[PDB]
Structure formats: C-alpha cells, structure tokens
Design a protein around this ligand. Structure first.
Ligand SMILES: *SCC1=CC(C)(C)N(O)C1(C)C
Length: 164
C-alpha cells in the first residue's frame, strides 16, 4: 500500500465525467473539474487540464496523469502551509499518507481548519485524534472513507485498506 493505491481505492477510477459525492463534476481518480453546475463548463476545464478537445472522456493514462499531478499538488500544498507542514513533518510515512488523503479530498484550507485534530496528531495522541477527526462534516458525509483514513491515523498501519 502507498498513497497512490490508497487514494485509488478511496476515489475510484471513472473515465467519463461524473458527479462526485458533493454533486460536482469530476473525472479520473477524483479529479475535480469545477463546482459549476454546467457540464459544458466541466468539459472546458477538462480539455484545458489535459490539453485536447475531449468528448468528456479520457483514457486511463490521462486519468493517471491528472492523479499524479493532484497527489503532488496535495503534498506541495501541505509543505507550503504553515499549519499542515509541522504536522506532516512530525508523522511517519503511513500517517503522512492519511494527511495527503484528507488534503486531496477537501483541500489544504479545509484540513488546516482541523486545529484540534492537528494538535492531537502532532502530540501523537492517536486515539484522541481519531475521536476528534470524526466530529466533522467530513466524517458525516463520507463516513466509510473517513473511517479508513481515521483508522490509518489511529494505527499507523494500512489495515483499513487491506483486502481493498
Ligand atoms: S467554465 C465557465 C463557463 C463555461 C460555459 C458553460 C461556456 N459558461 O457559460 C461559463 C463562462 C459559465
């Protein structure tokens, strides 16, 4: 297991524009195109992301290219963020993956708002952090995925993604 395999499980792979859990047009492995309710807009965003006039359909290689960019972007977003970087630096590589997962899903600003959880993670109070992480819109709206990420922070293992 690693952050790519982890997010491929949590995000899936779809080659045609689809709406994500929040109703927003997305493609590939969780690549958000736009919050606009316009499908033509989503397609315009898609075409400029991949560099060609798509029909709203991409290949697996193109999906993977966007996904690599998006994972890289989440990591660099963590390392540029004054609240997230010290927590990231303090973690082991498995828990680091859990933090990248969260930023991938909700963005740097949303994760940086989890001030209590981030303090408990930095303190390595893992069970307390797991309890606080669940007290969130995040958990309530995507509870199975949040449980997997939370189990990763609690245990520092990949047990929630084993067999998946
Ligand atoms: S992506 C922005 C956009 C796309 C399109 C559907 C052509 N639009 O009318 C606006 C400019 C909203």
């Amino acid at each position: 297991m690693n952050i790519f395999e982890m997010l491929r499980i949590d995000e899936g792979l779809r080659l045609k524009i689809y709406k994500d859990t929040e109703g927003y047009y997305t493609i590939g492995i969780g690549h958000l195109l736009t919050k606009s309710p316009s499908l033509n807009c989503a397609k315009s965003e898609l075409d400029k992301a991949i560099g060609r006039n798509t029909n709203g359909v991409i290949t697996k290689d193109e999906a993977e290219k966007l996904f690599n960019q998006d994972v890289d972007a989440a990591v660099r977003g963590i390392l540029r963020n004054a609240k997230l970087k010290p927590v990231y630096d303090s973690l082991d590589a498995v828990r680091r993956a859990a933090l990248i997962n969260m930023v991938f899903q909700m963005g740097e600003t949303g994760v940086a708002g989890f001030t209590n959880s981030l303090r408990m993670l930095q303190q390595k109070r893992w069970d307390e952090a797991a309890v606080n992480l669940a007290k969130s819109r995040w958990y309530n709206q995507t509870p199975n995925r949040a449980k997997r990420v939370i189990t990763t922070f609690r245990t520092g293992t990949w047990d929630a993604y084993k067999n998946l």
